[PDB]
mmCIF file of N, CA and C in Angstrom:
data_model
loop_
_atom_site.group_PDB
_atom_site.id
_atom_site.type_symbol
_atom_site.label_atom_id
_atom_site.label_comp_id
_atom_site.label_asym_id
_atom_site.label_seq_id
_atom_site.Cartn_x
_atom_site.Cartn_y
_atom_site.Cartn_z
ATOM 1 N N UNK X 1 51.863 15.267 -20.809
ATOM 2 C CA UNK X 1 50.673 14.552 -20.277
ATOM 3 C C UNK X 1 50.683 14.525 -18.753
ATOM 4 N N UNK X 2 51.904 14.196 -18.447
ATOM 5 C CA UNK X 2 51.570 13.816 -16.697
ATOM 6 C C UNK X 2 50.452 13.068 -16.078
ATOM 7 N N UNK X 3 50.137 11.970 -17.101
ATOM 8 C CA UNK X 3 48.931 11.084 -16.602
ATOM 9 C C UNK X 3 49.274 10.180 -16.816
ATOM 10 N N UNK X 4 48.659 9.725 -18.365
ATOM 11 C CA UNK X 4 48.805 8.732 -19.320
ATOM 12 C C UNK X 4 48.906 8.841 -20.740
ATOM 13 N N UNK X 5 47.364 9.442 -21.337
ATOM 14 C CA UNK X 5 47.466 9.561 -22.444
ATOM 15 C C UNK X 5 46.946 11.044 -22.581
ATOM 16 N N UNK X 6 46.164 11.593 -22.197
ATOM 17 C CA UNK X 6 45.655 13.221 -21.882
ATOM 18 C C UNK X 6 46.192 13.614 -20.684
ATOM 19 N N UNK X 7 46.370 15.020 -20.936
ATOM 20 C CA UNK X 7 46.913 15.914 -19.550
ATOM 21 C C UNK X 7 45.732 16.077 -18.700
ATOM 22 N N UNK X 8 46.666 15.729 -17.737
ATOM 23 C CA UNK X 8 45.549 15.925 -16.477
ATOM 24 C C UNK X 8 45.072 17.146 -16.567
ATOM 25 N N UNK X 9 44.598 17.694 -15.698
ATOM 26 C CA UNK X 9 43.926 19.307 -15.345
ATOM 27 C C UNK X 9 43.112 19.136 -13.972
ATOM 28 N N UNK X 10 43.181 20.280 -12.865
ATOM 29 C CA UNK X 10 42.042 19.839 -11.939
ATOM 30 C C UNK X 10 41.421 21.779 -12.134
ATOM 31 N N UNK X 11 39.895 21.354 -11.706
ATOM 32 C CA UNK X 11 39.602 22.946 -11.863
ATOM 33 C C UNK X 11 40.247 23.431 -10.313
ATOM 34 N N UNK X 12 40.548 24.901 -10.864
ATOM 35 C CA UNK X 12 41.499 25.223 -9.814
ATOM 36 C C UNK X 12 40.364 26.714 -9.479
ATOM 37 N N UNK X 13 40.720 27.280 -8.368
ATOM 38 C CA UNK X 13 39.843 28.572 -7.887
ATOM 39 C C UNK X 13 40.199 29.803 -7.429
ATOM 40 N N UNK X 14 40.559 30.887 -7.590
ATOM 41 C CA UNK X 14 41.201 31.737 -7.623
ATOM 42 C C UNK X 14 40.339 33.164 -7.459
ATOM 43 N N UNK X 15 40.859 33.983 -6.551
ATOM 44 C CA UNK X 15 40.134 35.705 -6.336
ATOM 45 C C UNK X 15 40.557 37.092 -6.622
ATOM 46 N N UNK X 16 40.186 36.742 -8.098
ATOM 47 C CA UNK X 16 40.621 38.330 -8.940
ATOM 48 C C UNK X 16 39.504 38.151 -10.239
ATOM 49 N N UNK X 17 39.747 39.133 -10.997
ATOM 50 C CA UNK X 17 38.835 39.314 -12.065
ATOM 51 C C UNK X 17 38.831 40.458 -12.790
ATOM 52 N N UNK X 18 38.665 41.796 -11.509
ATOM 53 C CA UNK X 18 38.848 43.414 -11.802
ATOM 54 C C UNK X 18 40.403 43.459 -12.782
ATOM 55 N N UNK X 19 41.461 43.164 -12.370
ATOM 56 C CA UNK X 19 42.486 43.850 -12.976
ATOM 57 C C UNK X 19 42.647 42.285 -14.290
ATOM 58 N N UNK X 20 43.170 41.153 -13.523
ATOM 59 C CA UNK X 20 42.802 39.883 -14.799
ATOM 60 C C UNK X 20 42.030 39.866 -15.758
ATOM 61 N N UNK X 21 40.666 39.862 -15.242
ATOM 62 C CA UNK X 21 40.072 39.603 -16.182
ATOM 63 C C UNK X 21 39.913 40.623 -17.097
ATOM 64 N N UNK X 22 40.050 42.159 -16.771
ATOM 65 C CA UNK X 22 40.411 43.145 -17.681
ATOM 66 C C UNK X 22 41.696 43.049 -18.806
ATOM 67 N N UNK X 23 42.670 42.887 -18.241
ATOM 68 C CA UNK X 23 43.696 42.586 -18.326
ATOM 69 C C UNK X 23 43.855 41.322 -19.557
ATOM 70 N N UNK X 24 43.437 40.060 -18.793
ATOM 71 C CA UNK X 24 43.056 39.075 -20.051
ATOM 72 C C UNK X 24 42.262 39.470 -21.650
ATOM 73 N N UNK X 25 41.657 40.657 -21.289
ATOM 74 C CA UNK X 25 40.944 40.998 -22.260
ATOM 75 C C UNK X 25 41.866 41.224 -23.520
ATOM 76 N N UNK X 26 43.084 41.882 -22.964
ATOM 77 C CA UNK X 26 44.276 42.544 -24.230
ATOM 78 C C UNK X 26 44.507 41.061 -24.386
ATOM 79 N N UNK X 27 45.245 40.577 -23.540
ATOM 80 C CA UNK X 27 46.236 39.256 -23.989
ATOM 81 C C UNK X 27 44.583 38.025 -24.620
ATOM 82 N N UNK X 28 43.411 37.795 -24.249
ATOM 83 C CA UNK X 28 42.854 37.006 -25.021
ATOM 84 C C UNK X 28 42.557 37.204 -26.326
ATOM 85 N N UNK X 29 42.848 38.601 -27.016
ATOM 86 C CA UNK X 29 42.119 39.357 -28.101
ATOM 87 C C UNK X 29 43.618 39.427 -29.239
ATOM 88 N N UNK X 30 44.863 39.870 -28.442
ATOM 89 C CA UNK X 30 46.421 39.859 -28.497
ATOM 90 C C UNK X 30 46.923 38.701 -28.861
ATOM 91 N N UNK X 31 46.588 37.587 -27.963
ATOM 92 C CA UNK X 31 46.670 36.061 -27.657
ATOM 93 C C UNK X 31 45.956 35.413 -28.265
ATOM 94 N N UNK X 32 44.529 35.651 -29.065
ATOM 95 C CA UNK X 32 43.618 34.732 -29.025
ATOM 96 C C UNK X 32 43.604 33.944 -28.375
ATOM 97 N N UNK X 33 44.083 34.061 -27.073
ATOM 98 C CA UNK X 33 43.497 32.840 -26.013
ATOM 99 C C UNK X 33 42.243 33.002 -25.109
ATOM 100 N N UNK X 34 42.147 32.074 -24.503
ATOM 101 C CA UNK X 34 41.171 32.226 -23.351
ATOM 102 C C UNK X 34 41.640 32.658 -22.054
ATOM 103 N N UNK X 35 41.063 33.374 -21.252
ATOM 104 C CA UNK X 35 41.491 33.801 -19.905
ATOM 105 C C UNK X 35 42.267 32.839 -18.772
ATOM 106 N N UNK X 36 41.613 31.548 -19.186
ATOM 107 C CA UNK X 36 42.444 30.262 -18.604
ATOM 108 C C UNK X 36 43.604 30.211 -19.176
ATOM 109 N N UNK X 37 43.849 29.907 -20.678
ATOM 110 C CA UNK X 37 45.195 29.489 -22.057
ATOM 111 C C UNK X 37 45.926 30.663 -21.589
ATOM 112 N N UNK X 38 45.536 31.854 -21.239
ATOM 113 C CA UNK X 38 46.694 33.105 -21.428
ATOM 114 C C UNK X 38 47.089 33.012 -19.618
ATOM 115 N N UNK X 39 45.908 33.034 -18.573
ATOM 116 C CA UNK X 39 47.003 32.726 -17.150
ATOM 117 C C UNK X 39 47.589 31.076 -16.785
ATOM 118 N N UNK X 40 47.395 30.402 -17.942
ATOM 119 C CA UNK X 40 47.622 28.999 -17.566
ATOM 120 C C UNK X 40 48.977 29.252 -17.910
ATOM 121 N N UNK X 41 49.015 29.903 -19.379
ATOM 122 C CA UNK X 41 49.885 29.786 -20.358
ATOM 123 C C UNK X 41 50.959 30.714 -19.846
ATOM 124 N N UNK X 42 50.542 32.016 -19.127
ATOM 125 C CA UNK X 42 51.672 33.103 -18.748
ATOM 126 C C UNK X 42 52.038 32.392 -17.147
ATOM 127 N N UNK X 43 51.002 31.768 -16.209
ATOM 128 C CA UNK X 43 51.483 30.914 -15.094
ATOM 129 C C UNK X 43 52.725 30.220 -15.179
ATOM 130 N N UNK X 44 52.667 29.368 -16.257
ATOM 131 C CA UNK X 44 54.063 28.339 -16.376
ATOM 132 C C UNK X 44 55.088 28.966 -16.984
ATOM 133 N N UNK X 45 54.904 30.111 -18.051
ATOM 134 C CA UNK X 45 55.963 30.468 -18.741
ATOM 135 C C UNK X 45 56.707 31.135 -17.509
ATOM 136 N N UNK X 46 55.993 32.461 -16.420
ATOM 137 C CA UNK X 46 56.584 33.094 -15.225
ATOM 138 C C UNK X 46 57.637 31.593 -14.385
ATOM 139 N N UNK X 47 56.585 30.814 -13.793
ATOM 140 C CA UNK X 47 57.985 30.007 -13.336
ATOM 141 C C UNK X 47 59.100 29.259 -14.398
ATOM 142 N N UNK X 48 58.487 28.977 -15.445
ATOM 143 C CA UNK X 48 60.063 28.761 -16.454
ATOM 144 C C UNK X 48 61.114 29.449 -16.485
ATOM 145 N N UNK X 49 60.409 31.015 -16.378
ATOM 146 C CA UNK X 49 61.827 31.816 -17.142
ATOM 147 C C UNK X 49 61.959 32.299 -15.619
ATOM 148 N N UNK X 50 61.061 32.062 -14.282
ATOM 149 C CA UNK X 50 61.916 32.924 -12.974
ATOM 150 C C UNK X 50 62.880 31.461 -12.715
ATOM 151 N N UNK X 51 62.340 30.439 -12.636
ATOM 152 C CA UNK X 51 62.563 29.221 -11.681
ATOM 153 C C UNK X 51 64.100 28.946 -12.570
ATOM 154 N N UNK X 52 63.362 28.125 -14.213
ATOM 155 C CA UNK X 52 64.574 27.845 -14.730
ATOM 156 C C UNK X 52 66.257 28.924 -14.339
ATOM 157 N N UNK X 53 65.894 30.086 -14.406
ATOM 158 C CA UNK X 53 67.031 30.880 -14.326
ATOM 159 C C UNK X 53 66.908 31.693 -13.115
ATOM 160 N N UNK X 54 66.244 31.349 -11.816
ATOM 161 C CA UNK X 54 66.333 32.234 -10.618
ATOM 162 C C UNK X 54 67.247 32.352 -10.397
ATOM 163 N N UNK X 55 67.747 33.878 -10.598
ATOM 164 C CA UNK X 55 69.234 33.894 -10.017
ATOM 165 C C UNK X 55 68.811 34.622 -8.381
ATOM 166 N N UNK X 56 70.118 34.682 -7.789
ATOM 167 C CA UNK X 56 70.235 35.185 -6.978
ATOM 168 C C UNK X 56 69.949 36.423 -6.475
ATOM 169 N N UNK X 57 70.076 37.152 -7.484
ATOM 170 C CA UNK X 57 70.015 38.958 -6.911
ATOM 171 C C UNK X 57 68.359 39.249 -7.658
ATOM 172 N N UNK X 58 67.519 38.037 -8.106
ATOM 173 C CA UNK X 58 66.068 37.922 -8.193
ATOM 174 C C UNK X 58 65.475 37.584 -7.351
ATOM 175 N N UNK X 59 66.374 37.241 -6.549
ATOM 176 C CA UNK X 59 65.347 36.723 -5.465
ATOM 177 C C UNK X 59 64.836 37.499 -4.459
ATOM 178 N N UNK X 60 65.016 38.429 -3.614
ATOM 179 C CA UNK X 60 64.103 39.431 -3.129
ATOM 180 C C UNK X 60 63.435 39.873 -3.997
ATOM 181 N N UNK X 61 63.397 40.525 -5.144
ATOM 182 C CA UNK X 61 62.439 40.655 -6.273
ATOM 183 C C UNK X 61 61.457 40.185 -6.411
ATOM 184 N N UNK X 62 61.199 38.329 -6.149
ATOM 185 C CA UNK X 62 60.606 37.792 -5.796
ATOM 186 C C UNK X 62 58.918 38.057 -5.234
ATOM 187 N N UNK X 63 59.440 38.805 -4.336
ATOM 188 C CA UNK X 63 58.581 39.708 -3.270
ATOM 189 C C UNK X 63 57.959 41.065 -4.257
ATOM 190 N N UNK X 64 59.037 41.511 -4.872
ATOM 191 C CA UNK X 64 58.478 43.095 -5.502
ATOM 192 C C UNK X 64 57.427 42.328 -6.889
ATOM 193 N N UNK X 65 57.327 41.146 -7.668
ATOM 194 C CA UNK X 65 56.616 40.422 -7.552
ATOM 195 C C UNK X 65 55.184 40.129 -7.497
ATOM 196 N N UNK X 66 55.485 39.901 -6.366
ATOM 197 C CA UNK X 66 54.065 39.418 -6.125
ATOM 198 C C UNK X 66 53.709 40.843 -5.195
ATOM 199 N N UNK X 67 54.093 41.830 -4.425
ATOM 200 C CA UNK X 67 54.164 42.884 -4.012
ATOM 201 C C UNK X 67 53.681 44.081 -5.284
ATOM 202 N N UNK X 68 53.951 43.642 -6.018
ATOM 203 C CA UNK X 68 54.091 45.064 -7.201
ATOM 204 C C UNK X 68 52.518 44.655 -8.421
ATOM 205 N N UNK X 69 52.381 43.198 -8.181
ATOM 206 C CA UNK X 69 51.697 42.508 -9.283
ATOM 207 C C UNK X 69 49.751 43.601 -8.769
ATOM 208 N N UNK X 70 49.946 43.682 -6.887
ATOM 209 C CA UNK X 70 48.759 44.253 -6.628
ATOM 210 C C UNK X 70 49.208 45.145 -6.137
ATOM 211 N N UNK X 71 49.072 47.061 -7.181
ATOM 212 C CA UNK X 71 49.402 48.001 -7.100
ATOM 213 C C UNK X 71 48.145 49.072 -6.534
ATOM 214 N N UNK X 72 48.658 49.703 -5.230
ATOM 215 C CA UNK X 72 47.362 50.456 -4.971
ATOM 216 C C UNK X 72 47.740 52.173 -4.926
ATOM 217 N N UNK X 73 46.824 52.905 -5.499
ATOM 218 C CA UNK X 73 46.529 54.118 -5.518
ATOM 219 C C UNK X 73 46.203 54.826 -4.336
ATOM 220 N N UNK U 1 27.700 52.953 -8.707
ATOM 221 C CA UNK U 1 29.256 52.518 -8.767
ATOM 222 C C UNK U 1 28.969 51.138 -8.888
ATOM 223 N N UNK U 2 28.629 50.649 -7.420
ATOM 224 C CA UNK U 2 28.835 48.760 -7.422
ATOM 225 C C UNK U 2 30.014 48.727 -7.677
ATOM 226 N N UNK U 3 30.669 49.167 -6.888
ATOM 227 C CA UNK U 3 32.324 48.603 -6.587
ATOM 228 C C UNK U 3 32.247 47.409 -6.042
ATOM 229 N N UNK U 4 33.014 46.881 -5.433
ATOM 230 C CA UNK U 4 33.344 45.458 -4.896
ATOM 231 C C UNK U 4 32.515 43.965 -5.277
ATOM 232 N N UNK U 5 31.727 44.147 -5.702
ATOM 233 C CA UNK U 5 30.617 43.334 -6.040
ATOM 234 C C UNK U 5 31.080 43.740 -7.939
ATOM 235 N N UNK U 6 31.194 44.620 -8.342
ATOM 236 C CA UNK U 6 31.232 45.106 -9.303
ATOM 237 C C UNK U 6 32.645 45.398 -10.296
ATOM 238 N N UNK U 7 33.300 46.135 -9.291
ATOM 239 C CA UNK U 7 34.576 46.602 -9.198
ATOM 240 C C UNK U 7 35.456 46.291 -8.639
ATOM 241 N N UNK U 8 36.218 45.201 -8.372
ATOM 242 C CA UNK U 8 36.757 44.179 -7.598
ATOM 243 C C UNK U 8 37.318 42.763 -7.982
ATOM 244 N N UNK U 9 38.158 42.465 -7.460
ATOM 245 C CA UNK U 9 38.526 40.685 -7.781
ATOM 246 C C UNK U 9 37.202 39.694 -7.704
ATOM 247 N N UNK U 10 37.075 38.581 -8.563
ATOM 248 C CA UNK U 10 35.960 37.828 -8.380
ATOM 249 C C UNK U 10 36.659 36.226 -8.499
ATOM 250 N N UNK U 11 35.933 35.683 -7.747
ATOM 251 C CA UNK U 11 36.430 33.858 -7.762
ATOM 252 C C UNK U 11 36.197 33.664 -8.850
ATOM 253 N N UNK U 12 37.756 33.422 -9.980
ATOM 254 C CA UNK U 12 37.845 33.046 -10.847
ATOM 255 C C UNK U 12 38.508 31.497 -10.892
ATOM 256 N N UNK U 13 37.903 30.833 -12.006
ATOM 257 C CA UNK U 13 38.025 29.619 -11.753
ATOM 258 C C UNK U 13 38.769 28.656 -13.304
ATOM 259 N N UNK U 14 39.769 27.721 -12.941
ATOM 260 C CA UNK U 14 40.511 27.715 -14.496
ATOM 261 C C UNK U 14 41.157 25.931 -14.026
ATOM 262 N N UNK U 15 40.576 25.440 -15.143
ATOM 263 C CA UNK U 15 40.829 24.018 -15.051
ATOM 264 C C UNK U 15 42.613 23.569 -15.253
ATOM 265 N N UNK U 16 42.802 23.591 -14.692
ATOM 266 C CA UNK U 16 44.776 22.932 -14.104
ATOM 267 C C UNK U 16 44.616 22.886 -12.992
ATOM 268 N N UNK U 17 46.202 22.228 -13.195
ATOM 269 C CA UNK U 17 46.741 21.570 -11.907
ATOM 270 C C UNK U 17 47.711 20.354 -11.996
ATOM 271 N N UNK U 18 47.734 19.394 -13.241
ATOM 272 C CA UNK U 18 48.801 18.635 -13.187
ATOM 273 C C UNK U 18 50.073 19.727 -13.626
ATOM 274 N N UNK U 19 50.156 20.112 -14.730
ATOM 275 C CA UNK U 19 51.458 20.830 -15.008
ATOM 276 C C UNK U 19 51.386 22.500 -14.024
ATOM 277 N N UNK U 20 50.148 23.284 -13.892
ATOM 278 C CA UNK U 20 50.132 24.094 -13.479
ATOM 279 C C UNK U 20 50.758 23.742 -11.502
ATOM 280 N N UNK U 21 49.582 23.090 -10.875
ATOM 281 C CA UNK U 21 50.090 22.647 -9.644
ATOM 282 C C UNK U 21 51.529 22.107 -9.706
ATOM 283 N N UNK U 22 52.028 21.637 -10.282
ATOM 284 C CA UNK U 22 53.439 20.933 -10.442
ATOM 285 C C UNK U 22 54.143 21.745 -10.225
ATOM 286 N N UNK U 23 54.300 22.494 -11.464
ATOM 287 C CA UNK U 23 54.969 23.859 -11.769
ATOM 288 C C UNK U 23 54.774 24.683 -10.118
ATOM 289 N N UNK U 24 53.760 25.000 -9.682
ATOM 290 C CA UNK U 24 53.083 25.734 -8.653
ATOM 291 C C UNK U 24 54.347 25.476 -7.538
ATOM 292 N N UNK U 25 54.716 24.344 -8.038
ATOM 293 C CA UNK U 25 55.363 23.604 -6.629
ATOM 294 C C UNK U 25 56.776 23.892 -6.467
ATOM 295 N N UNK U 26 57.801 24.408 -7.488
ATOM 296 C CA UNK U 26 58.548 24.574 -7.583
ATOM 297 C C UNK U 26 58.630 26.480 -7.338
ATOM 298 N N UNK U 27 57.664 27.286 -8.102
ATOM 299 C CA UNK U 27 57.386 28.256 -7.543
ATOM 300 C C UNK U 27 57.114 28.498 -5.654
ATOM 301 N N UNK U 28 55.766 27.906 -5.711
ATOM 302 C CA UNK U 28 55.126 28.042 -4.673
ATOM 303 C C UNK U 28 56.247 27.701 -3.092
ATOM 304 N N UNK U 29 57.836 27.049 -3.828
ATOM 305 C CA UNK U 29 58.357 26.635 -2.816
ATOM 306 C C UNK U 29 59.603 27.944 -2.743
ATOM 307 N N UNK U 30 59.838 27.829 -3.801
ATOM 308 C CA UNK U 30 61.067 29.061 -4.320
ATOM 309 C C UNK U 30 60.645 30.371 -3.872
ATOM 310 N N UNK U 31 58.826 30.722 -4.058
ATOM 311 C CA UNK U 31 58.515 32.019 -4.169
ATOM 312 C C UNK U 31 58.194 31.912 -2.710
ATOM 313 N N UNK U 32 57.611 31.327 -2.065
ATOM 314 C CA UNK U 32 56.526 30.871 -0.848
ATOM 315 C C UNK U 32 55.551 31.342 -1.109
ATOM 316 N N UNK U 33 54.953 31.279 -2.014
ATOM 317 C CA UNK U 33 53.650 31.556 -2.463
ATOM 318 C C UNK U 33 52.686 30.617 -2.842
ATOM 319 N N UNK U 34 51.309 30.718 -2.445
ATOM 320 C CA UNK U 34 50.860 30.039 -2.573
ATOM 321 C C UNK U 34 50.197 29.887 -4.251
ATOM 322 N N UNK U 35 49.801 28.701 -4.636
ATOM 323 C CA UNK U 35 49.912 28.481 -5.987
ATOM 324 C C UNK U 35 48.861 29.845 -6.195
ATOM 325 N N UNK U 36 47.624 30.062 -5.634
ATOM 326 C CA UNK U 36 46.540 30.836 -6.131
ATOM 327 C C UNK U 36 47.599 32.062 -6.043
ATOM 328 N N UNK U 37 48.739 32.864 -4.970
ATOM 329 C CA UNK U 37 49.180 34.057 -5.262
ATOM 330 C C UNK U 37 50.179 33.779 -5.885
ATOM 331 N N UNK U 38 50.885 33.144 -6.732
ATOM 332 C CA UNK U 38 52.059 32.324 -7.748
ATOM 333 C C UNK U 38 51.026 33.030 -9.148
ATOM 334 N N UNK U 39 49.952 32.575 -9.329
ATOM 335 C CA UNK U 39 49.369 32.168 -10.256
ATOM 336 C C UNK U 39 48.891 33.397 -10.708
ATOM 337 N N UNK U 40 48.586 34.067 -9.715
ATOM 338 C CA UNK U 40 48.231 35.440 -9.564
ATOM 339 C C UNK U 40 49.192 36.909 -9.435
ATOM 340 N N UNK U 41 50.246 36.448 -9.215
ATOM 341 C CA UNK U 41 51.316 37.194 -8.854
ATOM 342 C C UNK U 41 52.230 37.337 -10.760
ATOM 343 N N UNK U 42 52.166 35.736 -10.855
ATOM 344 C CA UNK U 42 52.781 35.791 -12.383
ATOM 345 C C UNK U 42 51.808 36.135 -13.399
ATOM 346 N N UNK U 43 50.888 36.504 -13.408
ATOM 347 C CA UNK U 43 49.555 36.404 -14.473
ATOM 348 C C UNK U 43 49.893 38.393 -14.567
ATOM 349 N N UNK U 44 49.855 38.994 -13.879
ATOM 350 C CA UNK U 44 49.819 40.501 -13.871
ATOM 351 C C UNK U 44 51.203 40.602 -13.944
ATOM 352 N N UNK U 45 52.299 40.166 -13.398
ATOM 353 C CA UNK U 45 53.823 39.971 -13.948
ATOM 354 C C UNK U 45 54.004 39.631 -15.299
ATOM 355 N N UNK U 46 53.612 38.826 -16.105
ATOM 356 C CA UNK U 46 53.527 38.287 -17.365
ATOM 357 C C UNK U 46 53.192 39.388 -18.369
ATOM 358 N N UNK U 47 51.662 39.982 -17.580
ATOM 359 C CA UNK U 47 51.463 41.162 -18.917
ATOM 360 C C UNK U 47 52.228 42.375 -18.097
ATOM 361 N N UNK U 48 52.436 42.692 -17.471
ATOM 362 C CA UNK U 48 53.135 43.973 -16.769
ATOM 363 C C UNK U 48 54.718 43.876 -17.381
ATOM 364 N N UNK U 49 54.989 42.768 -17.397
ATOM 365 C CA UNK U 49 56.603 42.600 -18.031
ATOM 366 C C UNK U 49 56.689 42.824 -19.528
ATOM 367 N N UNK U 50 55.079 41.418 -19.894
ATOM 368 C CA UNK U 50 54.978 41.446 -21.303
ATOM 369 C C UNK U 50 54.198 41.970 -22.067
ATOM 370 N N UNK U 51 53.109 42.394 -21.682
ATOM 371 C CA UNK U 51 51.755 43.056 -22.336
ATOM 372 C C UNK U 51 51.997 44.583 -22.269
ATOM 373 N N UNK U 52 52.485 44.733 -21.383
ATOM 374 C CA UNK U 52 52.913 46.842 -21.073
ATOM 375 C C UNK U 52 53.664 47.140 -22.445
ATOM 376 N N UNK U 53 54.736 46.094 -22.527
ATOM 377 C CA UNK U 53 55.310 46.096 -23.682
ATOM 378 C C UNK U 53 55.347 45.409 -24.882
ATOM 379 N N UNK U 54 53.881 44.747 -25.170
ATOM 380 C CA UNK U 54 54.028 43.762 -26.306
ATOM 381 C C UNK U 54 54.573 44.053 -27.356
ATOM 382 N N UNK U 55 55.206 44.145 -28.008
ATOM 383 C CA UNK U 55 56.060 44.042 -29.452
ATOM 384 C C UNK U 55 55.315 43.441 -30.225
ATOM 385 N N UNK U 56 55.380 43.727 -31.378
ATOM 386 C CA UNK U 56 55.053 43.113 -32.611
ATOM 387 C C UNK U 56 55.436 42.446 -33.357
ATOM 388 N N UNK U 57 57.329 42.156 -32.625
ATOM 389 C CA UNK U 57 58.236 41.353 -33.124
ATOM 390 C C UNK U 57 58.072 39.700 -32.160
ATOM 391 N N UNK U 58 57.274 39.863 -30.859
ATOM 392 C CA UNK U 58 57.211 39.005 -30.245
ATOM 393 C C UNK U 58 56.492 38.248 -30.319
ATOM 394 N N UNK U 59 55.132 38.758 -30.938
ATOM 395 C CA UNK U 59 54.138 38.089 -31.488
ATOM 396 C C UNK U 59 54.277 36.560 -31.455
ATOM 397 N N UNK U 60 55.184 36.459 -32.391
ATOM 398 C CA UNK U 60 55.691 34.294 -32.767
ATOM 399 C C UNK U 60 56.231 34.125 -31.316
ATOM 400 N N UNK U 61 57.008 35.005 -30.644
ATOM 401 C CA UNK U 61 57.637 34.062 -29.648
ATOM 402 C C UNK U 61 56.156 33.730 -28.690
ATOM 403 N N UNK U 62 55.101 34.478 -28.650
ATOM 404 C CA UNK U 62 53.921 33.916 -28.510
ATOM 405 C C UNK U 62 53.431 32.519 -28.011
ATOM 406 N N UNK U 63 54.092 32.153 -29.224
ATOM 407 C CA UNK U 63 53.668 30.751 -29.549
ATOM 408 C C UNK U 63 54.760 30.095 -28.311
ATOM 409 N N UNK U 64 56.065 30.280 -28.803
ATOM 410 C CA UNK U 64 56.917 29.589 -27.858
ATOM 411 C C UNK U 64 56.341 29.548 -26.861
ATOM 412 N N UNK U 65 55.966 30.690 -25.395
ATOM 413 C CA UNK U 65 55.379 30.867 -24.677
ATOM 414 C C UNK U 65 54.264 29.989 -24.268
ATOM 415 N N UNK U 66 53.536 29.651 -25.446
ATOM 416 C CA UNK U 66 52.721 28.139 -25.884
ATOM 417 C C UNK U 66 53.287 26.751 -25.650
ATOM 418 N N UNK U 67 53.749 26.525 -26.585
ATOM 419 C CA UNK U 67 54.647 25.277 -26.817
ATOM 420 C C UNK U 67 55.552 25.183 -25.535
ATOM 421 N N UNK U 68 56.466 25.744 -25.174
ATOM 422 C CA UNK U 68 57.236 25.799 -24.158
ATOM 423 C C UNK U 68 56.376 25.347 -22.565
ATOM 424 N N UNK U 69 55.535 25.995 -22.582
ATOM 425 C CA UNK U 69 54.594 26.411 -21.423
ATOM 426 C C UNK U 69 54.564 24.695 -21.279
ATOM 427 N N UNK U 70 54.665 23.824 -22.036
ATOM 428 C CA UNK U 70 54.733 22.322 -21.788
ATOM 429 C C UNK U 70 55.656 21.818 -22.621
ATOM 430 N N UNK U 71 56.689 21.455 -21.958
ATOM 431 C CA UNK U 71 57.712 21.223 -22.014
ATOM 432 C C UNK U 71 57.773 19.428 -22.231
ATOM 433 N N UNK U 72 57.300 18.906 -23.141
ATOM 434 C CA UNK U 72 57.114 17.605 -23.011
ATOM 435 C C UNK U 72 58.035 17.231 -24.138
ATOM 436 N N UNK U 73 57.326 17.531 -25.400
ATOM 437 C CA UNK U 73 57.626 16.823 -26.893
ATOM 438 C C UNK U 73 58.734 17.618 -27.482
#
């Protein structure tokens, strides 16, 4: 919850769509989720499994990342 | 064509922020990223790690990915 009795949520705003929202298409159809449920849902799981277990020799990786996530031709 | 207008990232918009921003924060401090390139960085990381290779055995862990993703109960 992180409130009280319902989970909070604030709308949040973000600039992509071309590769996401394509992209969401497998994992919402894969997922049956929604484009929100599958980057809400893959958002927290990425820092669980980097954060919970960031090791050390991940961490420049870090960079390849968010570096690698927008790949150009 | 209508590239960029067309073909391009678009202000996408997705209701979180208590667990997502939270979460964001521990990333956003670890990664230095800001939650929108956290959010964005792990969303194409997620299927690039996990969707390039979805399994059919992973399917249920799916769910974990779910359930986990809030770590409460």
């Amino acid at each position: 919850m992180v409130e009280s009795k319902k989970i909070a949520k604030k709308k949040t705003t973000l600039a992509f769509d071309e590769d996401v929202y394509h992209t969401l298409k497998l994992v919402s159809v894969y997922l049956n989720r929604d484009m929100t449920e599958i980057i809400e849902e893959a958002v927290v799981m990425w820092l669980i499994q980097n954060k919970e277990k960031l090791p050390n020799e991940l961490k420049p990786k870090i960079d390849e990342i968010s570096k690698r996530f927008f790949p150009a031709k």
